Amino acid sequence: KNPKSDKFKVKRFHHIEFWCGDATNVARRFSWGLGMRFSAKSDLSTGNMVHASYLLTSGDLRFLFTAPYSPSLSAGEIKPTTTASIPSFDHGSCRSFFSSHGLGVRAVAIEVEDAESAFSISVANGAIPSSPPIVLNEAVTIAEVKLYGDVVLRYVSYKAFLPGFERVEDASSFPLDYGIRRLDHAVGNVPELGPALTYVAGFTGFHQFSGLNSAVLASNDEMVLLPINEPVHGTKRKSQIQTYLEHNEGAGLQHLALMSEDIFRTLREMRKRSSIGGFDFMPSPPPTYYQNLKKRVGDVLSDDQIKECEELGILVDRDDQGTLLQIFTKPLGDRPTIFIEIIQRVGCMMYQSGGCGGFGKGNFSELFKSIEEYEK
Amino acid sequence: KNPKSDKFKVKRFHHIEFWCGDATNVARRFSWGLGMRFSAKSDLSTGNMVHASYLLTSGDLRFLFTAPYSPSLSAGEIKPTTTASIPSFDHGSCRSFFSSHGLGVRAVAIEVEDAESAFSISVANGAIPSSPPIVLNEAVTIAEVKLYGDVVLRYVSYKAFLPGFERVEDASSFPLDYGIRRLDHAVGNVPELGPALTYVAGFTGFHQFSGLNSAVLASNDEMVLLPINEPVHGTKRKSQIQTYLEHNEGAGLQHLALMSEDIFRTLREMRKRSSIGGFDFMPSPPPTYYQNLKKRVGDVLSDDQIKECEELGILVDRDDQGTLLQIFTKPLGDRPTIFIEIIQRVGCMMYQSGGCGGFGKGNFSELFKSIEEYEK
Ligand SMILES: Cc1ccc(C(=O)CN2C(=O)CSc3ccc(C(O)=C4C(=O)CCCC4=O)cc32)cc1
Ligand SMILES: Cc1ccc(C(=O)CN2C(=O)CSc3ccc(C(O)=C4C(=O)CCCC4=O)cc32)cc1
Ligand SMILES: [Co+2]
Ligand SMILES: [Co+2]
Numbered sequence: 001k002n003p004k005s006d007k008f009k010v011k012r013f014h015h016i017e018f019w020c021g022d023a024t025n026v027a028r029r030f031s032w033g034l035g036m037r038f039s040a041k042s043d044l045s046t047g048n049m050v051h052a053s054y055l056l057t058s059g060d061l062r063f064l065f066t067a068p069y070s071p072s073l074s075a076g077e078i079k080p081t082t083t084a085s086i087p088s089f090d091h092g093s094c095r096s097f098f099s100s101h102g103l104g105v106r107a108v109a110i111e112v113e114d115a116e117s118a119f120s121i122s123v124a125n126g127a128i129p130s131s132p133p134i135v136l137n138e139a140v141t142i143a144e145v146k147l148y149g150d151v152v153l154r155y156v157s158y159k160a161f162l163p164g165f166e167r168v169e170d171a172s173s174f175p176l177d178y179g180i181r182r183l184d185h186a187v188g189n190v191p192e193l194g195p196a197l198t199y200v201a202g203f204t205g206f207h208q209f210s211g212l213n214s215a216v217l218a219s220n221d222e223m224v225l226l227p228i229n230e231p232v233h234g235t236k237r238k239s240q241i242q243t244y245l246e247h248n249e250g251a252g253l254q255h256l257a258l259m260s261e262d263i264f265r266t267l268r269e270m271r272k273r274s275s276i277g278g279f280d281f282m283p284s285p286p287p288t289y290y291q292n293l294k295k296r297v298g299d300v301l302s303d304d305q306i307k308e309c310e311e312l313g314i315l316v317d318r319d320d321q322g323t324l325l326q327i328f329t330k331p332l333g334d335r336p337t338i339f340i341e342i343i344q345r346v347g348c349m350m351y352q353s354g355g356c357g358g359f360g361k362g363n364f365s366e367l368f369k370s371i372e373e374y375e376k
Numbered sequence: 377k378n379p380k381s382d383k384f385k386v387k388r389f390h391h392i393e394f395w396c397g398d399a400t401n402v403a404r405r406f407s408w409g410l411g412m413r414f415s416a417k418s419d420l421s422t423g424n425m426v427h428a429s430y431l432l433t434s435g436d437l438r439f440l441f442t443a444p445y446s447p448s449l450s451a452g453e454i455k456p457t458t459t460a461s462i463p464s465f466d467h468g469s470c471r472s473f474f475s476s477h478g479l480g481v482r483a484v485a486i487e488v489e490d491a492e493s494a495f496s497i498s499v500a501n502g503a504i505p506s507s508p509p510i511v512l513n514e515a516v517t518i519a520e521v522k523l524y525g526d527v528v529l530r531y532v533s534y535k536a537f538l539p540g541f542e543r544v545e546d547a548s549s550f551p552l553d554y555g556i557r558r559l560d561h562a563v564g565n566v567p568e569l570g571p572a573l574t575y576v577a578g579f580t581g582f583h584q585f586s587g588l589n590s591a592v593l594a595s596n597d598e599m600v601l602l603p604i605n606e607p608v609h610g611t612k613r614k615s616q617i618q619t620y621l622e623h624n625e626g627a628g629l630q631h632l633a634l635m636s637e638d639i640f641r642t643l644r645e646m647r648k649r650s651s652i653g654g655f656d657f658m659p660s661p662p663p664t665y666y667q668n669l670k671k672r673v674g675d676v677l678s679d680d681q682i683k684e685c686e687e688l689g690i691l692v693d694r695d696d697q698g699t700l701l702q703i704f705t706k707p708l709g710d711r712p713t714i715f716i717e718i719i720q721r722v723g724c725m726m727y728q729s730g731g732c733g734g735f736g737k738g739n740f741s742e743l744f745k746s747i748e749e750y751e752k
Contacts, residue, residue, distance in 0.1 A: 020397065020398070021396065021397020021398060021443075021474055021478070021479065022396070022397060022402065022478060022479040022709040022710050023710055024708075024709050024710045025401055025402045025405045025406075025479065025708075025709055026398065026401045028405050028409075028653045028654075029401045029404050029405045029653060030401075031652070031653055032408060032652050032653030033404075033653075038651075043710070044712070052710040067397075067478075067710050069478075069623070069710070069711065070476075070478075070623060070624075070625050070711075072622070072625065073622075073623070095475055098397055099471055100446075102397070102398060102443075102445075102446075103397065103398040103401065171651060172650075172651055172656070173651070174651035174652050176652060246448070246449075247445070247446060247449070248446075249446050249448065274548075275414075275547060275548055275549070275550035276407070276408050276550050276552060277404045277405060277407055277408030277409075277653055278404075280548070332400075332401075333398040333400050333401055334398050334399055334400045334419070334428040334443050334445070335445065335446075336420070
C-alpha cells in the first residue's frame with residue numbers, strides 16, 4: 001500500500017554533503033575511489049572566505065565535501081555580508097560535528113518544488129528547524145530541518161549547482177566514471193526506531209515502504225527512500241548498530257546506497273583501486289552462498305553472470321517484484337561508522353519503480369545459512 | 377664553515393607526523409599521489425582506543441597520519457593504562473591544532489642516539505618541553521620539544537616503526553613507488569626569523585648552513601636541514617610567507633622537500649595522477665626559463681635532459697658545489713599553507729654531501745628574470 005501522503009511535492013535526491021576536516025583530501029580520495037568527477041567548487045578562489053566546498057558528480061549522484069577555514073578570514077563578516085555560498089554553514093557547528101562524529105554526512109538534500117513551503121509545512125508538522133529558507137541570487141531556495149542526530153534534511157528548490165559555485169577547470173576535471181548513476185537510498189542509525197519513524201513520517205508525510213530492526217520511509221513515487229535502523233540488544237554477537245552509535249557518539253547516517261548502471265563494471269573498477277587509494281570491501285560470502293544462488297535467482301542471472309557475482313563478492317536478494325545486486329564497502333574513514341553500498345536493481349519495469357527488489361534483508365538469513373553450510 | 381656544534385648526537389630525519397581530522401582519507405590520498413606504500417598501523421584493530429595512526433613509506437621517507445577517536449572510547453584510561461601507541465598524543469591538543477591550523481605537520485622527528493639525553497640537553501639549553509622522554513616496550517624512547525608554532529621536534533632513539541604498531545597485511549600494502557627516497561629538508565614559516573633561529577640553534581647546537589628572508593640550520597653532517605623563513609612586508613606583491621601565517625593562524629611548517637632518485641620518473645608519475653586524486657603542481661616557468669638553462673647548467677644537463685625538465689616544469693639551480701633540480705606542488709589541503717617540494721641533487725660526491733647545490737634561492741631571480749623576458 002502507498003497512501004501517497006507526502007505533505008509537499010518532493011522530486012528526487014539532490015545531493016549529499018559530508019562535513020570534513022580537510023575537504024580537498026576527502027574529495028580527492030572519493031573521486032578516485034568511486035569514479036566521480038570534480039564538477040563545481042566554492043572556496044577562496046571563488047571569493048568564499050568561510051568554507052571550502054567541492055562537488056563531485058557521477059551521473060545524477062552529487063557528493064559535496066565541505067570544511068571550514070580559519071574564522072579569522074571572515075571575522076568582519078555578518079550574515080547579511082557573508083561570502084559563504086551555503087548560508088546554513090557555521091564554523092562552530094561544523095567543527096563540533098566533526099569533533100563529535102568524525103567524517104560523515106551532515107546533509108541529505110532532496111529537491112522539492114518550493115523549499116520555503118516544504119520548510120513551513122515540515123515545521124508546522126513537528127520538524128525541528130535547523131536553517132530557515134534562504135533565497136540565493138533570486139534563483140535557488142535552501143532550507144534545513146533536523147533528520148536524526150546531527151544530520152539535517154535539506155530542501156532545495158530551483159526557480160528554473162548553487163549560486164556562488166563555479167564549474168571547475170577542464171584539466172582538474174578528469175572524466176572518471178565507473179558506472180555510478182544516482183543515490184538509491186540513505187540509511188540512518190538511531191537508538192530507538194519508533195520515535196525516529198514517528199518524527200520523520202510526521203513532518204514529511206512519507207509512508208512506510210540479526211542485531212537490528214529496520215523500517216523504510218518513502219516519498220509518493222518511492223524514489224526518495226530513507227531506511228532507519230535501531231539496535232537489538234542482548235544478542236550473542238554485539239549489534240553493529242550499537243557499535244555505530246558508540247563510535248559515532250550517537251545517531252547519524254549509516255550508509256549511502258549508490259545505484260550503478262553496470263554493477264559488474266563498477267566493482268571491477270573500484271576493486272582495482274582498493275589498495276591504491278580507493279575503497280575496501282567487506283569480506284565476501286563463502287562459495288556456498290554462490291552455490292545457493294542458482295536455486296534462488298537462476299531464472300534471473302545466468303551461470304556466467306552468477307560466476308561474475310562470485311568473482312566480485314556481490315550479494316543477491318529477491319522479493320516479490322524484483323531482484324537486487326548489492327555489495328558493501330568497509331567504513332569510509334577512521335571510525336567504524338559510515339559505509340557505502342553499491343546496488344543495481346532488476347525488474348519492476350513500468351521506467352523502473354523505486355526500491356525494486358527491496359533492501360537485501362533476505363541476505364541476513366542467506367549469509368548466516370551460507371556461513372554454517374560452508375563449515376561443511 | 378661547519379663548527380660541528382651539535383649538543384647531542386643526531387642521526388637522520390626519521391618521520392614526519394601529520395595531524396588530521398580523518399587519517400584514513402589523507403593517508404590514502406597521499407599514498408596514491410606520492411607513490412608511498414602503507415607499511416604500519418596503530419588503530420582500533422591493534423587495540424589503540426585513542427588515536428588512529430597510519431604509516432606510509434617510500435625508501436627511507438616515513439609519513440605518519442594521525443587522528444583522534446572519540447574520547448569516550450578511552451574515557452576510563454589514564455596515562456599509566458593508555459592504549460595509545462604514541463604517548464605524547466592528546467585528544468584536546470590534536471583537535472585544537474587541527475581547528476587552528478587545518479591539515480599540517482605536528483612533528484618533525486629526528487633519530488638521535490639517546491632521546492632522553494637529547495631532551496635533557498635541549499631543555500637545559502632553552503628548549504620548551506612538549507612531551508617528556510617515554511620508553512616504549514623497553515625498546516624505543518621518544519621525547520618532544522617545541523620547534524615553532526605548534527610544531528614539535530620529536531627525538532626518537534632505538535636500543536637496537538614503534539612498539540604497538542603492526543605491519544600491514546599484504547593486500548592493503550600495494551608496492552607503489554614513484555622514486556621518492558628520503559626527506560631532504562623541512563621548512564618553517566615564522567613571523568620573525570631572528571628569534572626563531574636563536575631559539576632552535578640555541579637548544580640544538582645546529583649551525584647556519586622576493587617576499588622573504590630565510591636561513592638554514594643544519595646538524596653536524598648537514599643531513600638534518602631545517603630552513604626557516606620570515607616575511608618581508610611593504611612589498612608590491614604580498615609576501616607568500618605572510619599569506620601562510622594568516623591562513624595557518626601563525627607559524628608552522630611550510631614545506632617538506634622529498635629527495636627522488638629519479639626526479640623525471642617521479643614527476644611523470646605524480647603528474648599522471650594530479651587530476652585523479654593526486655597532487656597538483658604550481659604553474660610552470662615560461663619557455664624563456666628553459667632557454668636560459670643552457671647557459672646556466674649546459675655543462676651538467678644535456679639538451680634532452682633540459683627538454684625533459686621543460687616537459688615536466690622542473691626548476692634548476694646551481695651553487696659553487698652542485699646543482700639542484702626542484703619542483704613545487706600546490707598546497708596539500710584546503711588552506712594555502714603547506715606544500716611539497718620534489719628535489720634531486722647533482723654533485724658533492726665524496727656518498728653525497730647534504731644540501732648539495734643549495735635550496736634554489738637563485739631561482740627567485742631567474743624566474744623574475746624569465747617572466748619579464750617572456751613578455752618579449
Ligand atoms: C561497515 C559495515 C557495517 C555493516 C554492514 C552491513 O550491515 C551490510 N549488510 C550485512 O552485512 C548483512 S546483509 C545486508 C542486507 C541489507 C543491508 C542494508 O543495506 C539495509 C538497508 O539498506 C536498509 C534495510 C536494512 C539494511 O541493513 C545491509 C547488509 C556493512 C558494512
Ligand atoms: C603554495 C606554494 C607557496 C610558495 C612556493 C614557493 O615559494 C616555491 N618557490 C618559488 O616559487 C620561487 S623559486 C623557490 C626557490 C626555493 C624555494 C625553497 O624551497 C626555499 C627553501 O627550501 C629554503 C630556503 C628558501 C626557499 O624558499 C622555494 C621556491 C611554492 C608553493
Ligand atoms: Co542498503
Ligand atoms: Co625547499
